[PDB]
């Protein structure tokens, strides 16, 4: 198949506004939400309709429990940041953890950490430590390096457990995640010749613009892919004309081992 | 999710003894084995979630996860070390399954 | 310090009789446990708590009940005891739960007979 991913998020906040969550947790299965808990639920969630029919009362139930233990780490952690940082106000603290099933079966597998948005701790699975930014996470990569059984455990996690899950989940949600719906692909003038491209899945297209059969990546302006709302995404990519010769201009679509090709009259 | 040991191993003072431990489970977390002495509370022993071994004094820890086995050796046997030995493992769920423990004699 | 401190470390019982087995650890842990060990089977954990403030039913809840009242204290109730109630009752703790390499500290155990 395509390669995939699962992939955790934890936020926390140490002065929220009020009715805001002091903590959230999200997993993912590529874009896809498929999980969520927060601190004033207090309850995890399925965000798929496709995790809900395929995961029994009992693993919501004891994932429910776990993530109210790690919701109270994960603000005494904050908590001791944001002293040794010294700072006051409303800061947050965040977690990625996940994994991917590359295409060719070879895997990946992260773990990492923000504080007020910038990384802050950065796990490596094979030298089995921790990258610190500055001399606050100095102190907590000391603090986790000297247990070393953990980092054994992540790597395990990361490495077995976690691609276990991703493969359980994508079969779960198959005819979600492994179907393919085509591009519709436009061409406009706006003078910037805009390619347009609508109604794709899955979310990861490629479009450019060759003039006279060559790329020209600094020319072109890329516009980001953008959910439609219905389950399918958009995209675009321009580029602007010279009214001094004439050029063969052509936009460039490839989507799912597909590739498209309009040329410019 | 079964875990399984021997019930009880009988060893000579000074001599070398390997208690076994397989395991079935739905997903794996690592490995524990802990001690109790009769009458008394279990007490951790070691940790084991990578293949390998690995050593803490007289008692390594050795485990293979594709054969799903553990094995605790125990070197020098003393009397001290008459005790039970119970095998645990953390399923995908962070769940512990213990074993039944097995029973160690030392025979002066 | 102490470690987990459980109380009592025995006590017979009349089928019917309410009982409630006091566990407390003073190692600022976050995660306490209430098992029962019989013979000729492992550990069978009887209710938890993740964290202070939540609690919830293990593999064998039935005829029991918990209260996590405060972050050292996890006590174990019996309202009506039964004889399949004899055991040998042990409260843990660790310090989080839902991380792979942490351990249990054990107490030293409570021996109830339930008798007709």
């Known amino acids: 198949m395509r390669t995939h991913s699962l992939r955790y998020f934890r936020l926390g906040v140490s002065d929220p506004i009020h009715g805001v969550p002091e903590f959230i947790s999200v997993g993912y299965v590529d874009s896809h939400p498929i999980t969520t808990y927060d601190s004033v639920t207090r309850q995890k969630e399925p965000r798929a309709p496709w995790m809900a029919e395929n995961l029994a009362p009992d693993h919501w139930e004891r994932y429910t429990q776990l993530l109210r233990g790690w919701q109270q780490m994960f603000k005494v952690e904050l908590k001791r940041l944001q002293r040794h940082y010294n700072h006051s106000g409303s800061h947050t603290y965040q977690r990625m953890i996940g994994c991917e099933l590359l295409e060719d079966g070879s895997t990946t597998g992260f773990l990492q950490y923000a504080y007020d948005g910038q990384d802050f701790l950065i796990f490596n699975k094979d030298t089995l430590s921790w990258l610190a930014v500055d001399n606050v996470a100095h102190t907590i990569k000391q603090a986790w390096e000297a247990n070393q059984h953990e980092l054994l455990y992540q790597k395990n996690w990361l490495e077995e457990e976690c691609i276990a899950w991703l493969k359980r989940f994508l079969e779960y949600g198959k005819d979600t995640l492994q179907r393919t719906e085509p591009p519709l692909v436009r061409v406009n003038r706006k003078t910037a010749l805009f390619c347009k491209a609508h109604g794709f899945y899955p979310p990861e297209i490629y479009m450019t613009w060759m003039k006279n059969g060559e790329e020209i990546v600094q020319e072109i302006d890329y516009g980001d892919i953008l959910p439609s709302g219905d389950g399918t995404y958009q995209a675009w990519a321009s580029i602007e004309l010279d009214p001094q010769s004439s050029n063969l201009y052509s936009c460039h679509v490839e989507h799912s081992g597909v590739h498209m090709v309009l040329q410019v009259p | 999710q079964n875990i399984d040991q021997p019930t009880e191993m009988t060893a000579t003072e000074g001599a070398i003894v390997q208690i076994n431990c397989t395991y079935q489970?739905?997903?794996?977390?690592?490995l524990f084995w802990y001690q109790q002495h009769a009458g008394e509370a279990p007490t951790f022993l070691s940790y084991?979630?990578l293949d390998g071994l690995e050593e803490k004094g007289r008692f390594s820890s050795f485990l293979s996860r594709s054969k799903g086995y553990s094995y605790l050796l125990l070197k020098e046997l003393q009397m001290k070390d008459s005790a039970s030995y119970l095998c645990?493992?953390?399923?995908?769920?962070?769940?512990?399954?213990w074993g039944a423990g097995t029973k160690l004699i030392i025979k002066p | 310090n102490a470690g987990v401190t459980q109380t009592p470390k025995f006590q017979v019982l009349k089928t019917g009789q309410s009982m409630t087995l006091q566990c407390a650890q003073d190692?600022?842990?976050?995660?306490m446990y209430w098992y029962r060990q019989d013979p000729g089977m492992g550990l069978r954990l009887i209710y938890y708590?993740?964290?202070?403030?939540?609690?919830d039913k293990g593999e064998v809840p039935n005829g029991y009940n918990v209260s996590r009242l405060n972050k050292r204290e996890f006590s174990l109730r019996l309202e009506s005891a039964a004889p399949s109630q004899t055991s040998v009752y042990f409260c843990?703790?660790?310090?989080?739960?839902?991380?792979?390499?942490?351990?249990?500290?054990f107490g030293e155990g409570s021996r109830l007979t339930v008798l007709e």
């Open positions: 489970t739905s997903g794996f977390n690592g």
């Open positions: 645990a493992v953390k399923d995908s769920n962070y769940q512990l399954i």
């Open positions: 084991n979630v």
């Open positions: 843990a703790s660790s310090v989080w739960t839902g991380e792979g390499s942490g351990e249990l500290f």
């Open positions: 708590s993740a964290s202070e403030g939540t609690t």
């Open positions: 190692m600022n842990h976050n995660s």
